[PDB]
Amino acid sequence: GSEYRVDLVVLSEQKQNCRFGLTFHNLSDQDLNSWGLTFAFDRYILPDSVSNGQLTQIGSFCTLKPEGIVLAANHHYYCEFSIGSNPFRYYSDGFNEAMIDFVVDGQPQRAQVDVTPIVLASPYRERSDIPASLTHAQPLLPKPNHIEVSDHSFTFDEQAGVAIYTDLANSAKAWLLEELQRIHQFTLSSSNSGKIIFKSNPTLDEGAYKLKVSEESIKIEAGSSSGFTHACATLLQLLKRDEATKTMEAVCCSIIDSPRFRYRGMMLDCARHFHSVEQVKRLINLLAHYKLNTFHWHLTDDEGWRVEIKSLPQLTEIGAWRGIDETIEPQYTHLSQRYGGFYTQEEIRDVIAFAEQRGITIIPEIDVPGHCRAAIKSLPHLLIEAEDTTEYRSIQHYNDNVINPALPGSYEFIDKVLEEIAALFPAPYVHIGADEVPNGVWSKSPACQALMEQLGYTDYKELQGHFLRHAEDKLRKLGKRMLGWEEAQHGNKVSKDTVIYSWLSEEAALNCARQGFDVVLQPAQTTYLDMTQDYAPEEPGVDWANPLPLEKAYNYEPLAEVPADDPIRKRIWGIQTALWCEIINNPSRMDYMIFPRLTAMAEACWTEKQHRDWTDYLSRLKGHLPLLDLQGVNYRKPWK
Numbered sequence: 001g002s003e004y005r006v007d008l009v010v011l012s013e014q015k016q017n018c019r020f021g022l023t024f025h026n027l028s029d030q031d032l033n034s035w036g037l038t039f040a041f042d043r044y045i046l047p048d049s050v051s052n053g054q055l056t057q058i059g060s061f062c063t064l065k066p067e068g069i070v071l072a073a074n075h076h077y078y079c080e081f082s083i084g085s086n087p088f089r090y091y092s093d094g095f096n097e098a099m100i101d102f103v104v105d106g107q108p109q110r111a112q113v114d115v116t117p118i119v120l121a122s123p124y125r126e127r128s129d130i131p132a133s134l135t136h137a138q139p140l141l142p143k144p145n146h147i148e149v150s151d152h153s154f155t156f157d158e159q160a161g162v163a164i165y166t167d168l169a170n171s172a173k174a175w176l177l178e179e180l181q182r183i184h185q186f187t188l189s190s191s192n193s194g195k196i197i198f199k200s201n202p203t204l205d206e207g208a209y210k211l212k213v214s215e216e217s218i219k220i221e222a223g224s225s226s227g228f229t230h231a232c233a234t235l236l237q238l239l240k241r242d243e244a245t246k247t248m249e250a251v252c253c254s255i256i257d258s259p260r261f262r263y264r265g266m267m268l269d270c271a272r273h274f275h276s277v278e279q280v281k282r283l284i285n286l287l288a289h290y291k292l293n294t295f296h297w298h299l300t301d302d303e304g305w306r307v308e309i310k311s312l313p314q315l316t317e318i319g320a321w322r323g324i325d326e327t328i329e330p331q332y333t334h335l336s337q338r339y340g341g342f343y344t345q346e347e348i349r350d351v352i353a354f355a356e357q358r359g360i361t362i363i364p365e366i367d368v369p370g371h372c373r374a375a376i377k378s379l380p381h382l383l384i385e386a387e388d389t390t391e392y393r394s395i396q397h398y399n400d401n402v403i404n405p406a407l408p409g410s411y412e413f414i415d416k417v418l419e420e421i422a423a424l425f426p427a428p429y430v431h432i433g434a435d436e437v438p439n440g441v442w443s444k445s446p447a448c449q450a451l452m453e454q455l456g457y458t459d460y461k462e463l464q465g466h467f468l469r470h471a472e473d474k475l476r477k478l479g480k481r482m483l484g485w486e487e488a489q490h491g492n493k494v495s496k497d498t499v500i501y502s503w504l505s506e507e508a509a510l511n512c513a514r515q516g517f518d519v520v521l522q523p524a525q526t527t528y529l530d531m532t533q534d535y536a537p538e539e540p541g542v543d544w545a546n547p548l549p550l551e552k553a554y555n556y557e558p559l560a561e562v563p564a565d566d567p568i569r570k571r572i573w574g575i576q577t578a579l580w581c582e583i584i585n586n587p588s589r590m591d592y593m594i595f596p597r598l599t600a601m602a603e604a605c606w607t608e609k610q611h612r613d614w615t616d617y618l619s620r621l622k623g624h625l626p627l628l629d630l631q632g633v634n635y636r637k638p639w640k
């Protein structure tokens with residue numbers, strides 16, 4: 001391939017102390033003058049471990065520059081270094097991207113470096129195996145909580161017609177027709193005497209529906225828009241197309257259906273890598289296919305700010321872009337280009353309208369006071385304290401990325417973001433983040449030192465709560481309830497109205513629910529679509545929780561140990577599944593990580609525990625698979 005190649009090797013592993021060898025090959029014919037290697041690595045390289053040369057790390061962005069000044073043609077450079085971390089189980093744990101800057105007979109140059117797959121020392125031997133499976137006659141995902149199926153069937157064609165006798169169901173019906181068209185080039189038209197009938201039924205509670213196929217008709221009953229949307233999403237899975245006759249076929253059957261959990265979410269990280277309006281919409285559409293109702297928009301982080309804030313235009317003019325010649329350095333991938341994007345308010349209004357039509361509420365996340373590098377680099381005049389010499393390092397290996405809660409500019413900033421955010425997103429909810437604020441922060445900040453004294457705080461976590469409580473008070477004045485990751489509770493300053501997302505595990509969900517907090521369960525051990533799907537080292541993904549095979553994700557039972565009687569269970573809003581995109585930058589990888597485990601997650605959100613069975617779910621998945629092939633969704637194939 002390239003004339004420049006880097007080989008990385010696990011030399012040795014002693015508990016939490018891994019030594020690597022790095023060999024850089026100048027394969028070409030030229031001597032390389034004053035050169036330097038830059039790559040993307042998500043582990044923190046111990047700076048005093050480096051064997052040979054100068055190495056710099058800013059998050060994932062590393063540069064290696066040799067002690068010497070020339071790399072001879074056909075030779076190479078060698079460097080060793082160590083990290084604290086458990087053994088690498090995956091090729092993904094290696095460098096994601098490498099590139100070289102150099103000079104040749106006097107001329108600056110830049111070239112892509114081939115990155116050889118890391119030579120692993122301790123791959124896994126175990127493999128998750130999925131058994132051979134039948135195709136299920138009704139490949140429905142999530143499994144309806146009641147369904148009776150008859151021996152016969154109702155066949156119908158493009159003149160069958162669609163009847164609607166309540167305006168609650170107008171959105172569902174137009175979503176149904178749209179999807180029949182997009183997925184199947186099957187055009188239904190609306191007629192007063194259609195064989196598909198949307199009628200109202202007020203005994204059915206929110207999101208419940210009834211669907212009955214008979215020899216004459218197909219009837220959809222619900223008391224809510226969302227129940228009509230859910231019914232339509234079952235019907236799209238139920239129908240079976242004959243292209244030779246251009247007919248649809250649905251088994252005669254009776255379905256009565258309702259969700260186990262009110263909160264059935266999916267979060268998408270769009271800060272680490274930007275995804276297009278069309279990709280985001282395409283996802284939201286696929287979310288309503290499985291009857292989820294919440295799209296949690298992670299729009300802000302250290303490596304990107306993706307939501308336009310008219311009153312703070314720097315946040316996108318600067319924070320939406322990173323790379324060598326930008327204010328923000330390259331991160332994770334696209335080392336050689338200017339990389340980014342962002343959503344305008346008009347785009348966002350469009351995505352909201354699109355998702356409303358699908359029964360999906362969108363919750364924006366403005367992540368503070370950690371994970372703020374992009375905001376801080378965009379707005380240094382409001383968010384930097386020049387006099388702070390606290391030396392800290394975050395989980396992602398930044399030391400300059402945390403909001404200062406004693407700076408009046410930090411309140412200027414958040415008051416302005418939240419006002420526009422609140423105005424923009426109709427949902428009565430704003431997620432404030434609050435994850436992974438490093439332990440050392442603010443300890444040497446004069447301004448924080450003075451505010452710590454001024455109101456008698458004894459812990460610097462108390463300063464974080466002070467800020468989040470201000471965010472909550474502003475959100476409340478704007479009509480929004482605040483949501484937060486579990487660490488928002490740190491400092492015990494935020495009110496019992498803050499909805500706690502439990503992600504490290506289910507522990508905070510349990511603890512916080514006992515104390516009167518409403519919680520959402522997003523445990524990393526069972527709900528993170530960025531985790532690898534198998535133990536084979538070729539599986540893309542990360543693994544800090546644990547590998548998450550399909551069967552693990554399916555068999556997740558939320559708070560499996562709180563008895564169903566327990567009034568703790570009244571504080572569970574529901575479940576969320578998340579995709580963080582550190583190593584995800586293209587729709588093909590996205591689809592692979594999300595599907596199919598998302599459908600196992602939608603079934604935990606929706607179906608009652610007593611109707612959930614692994615073997616049964618695999619046969620419904622096997623019969624759904626073709627429907628994702630028709631949509632060109634690049635799911636990881638259970639059976640390959």
Ligand SMILES: CC1=N[C@@H]2[C@@H](O)[C@H](O)[C@@H](CO)O[C@@H]2S1
Nearest residue numbers: 435436485503528530580581
């Ligand atoms: C809350 C969370 N903040 C971290 C995120 O910034 C990372 O992307 C994710 C990767 O799994 O780990 C947790 S979850």
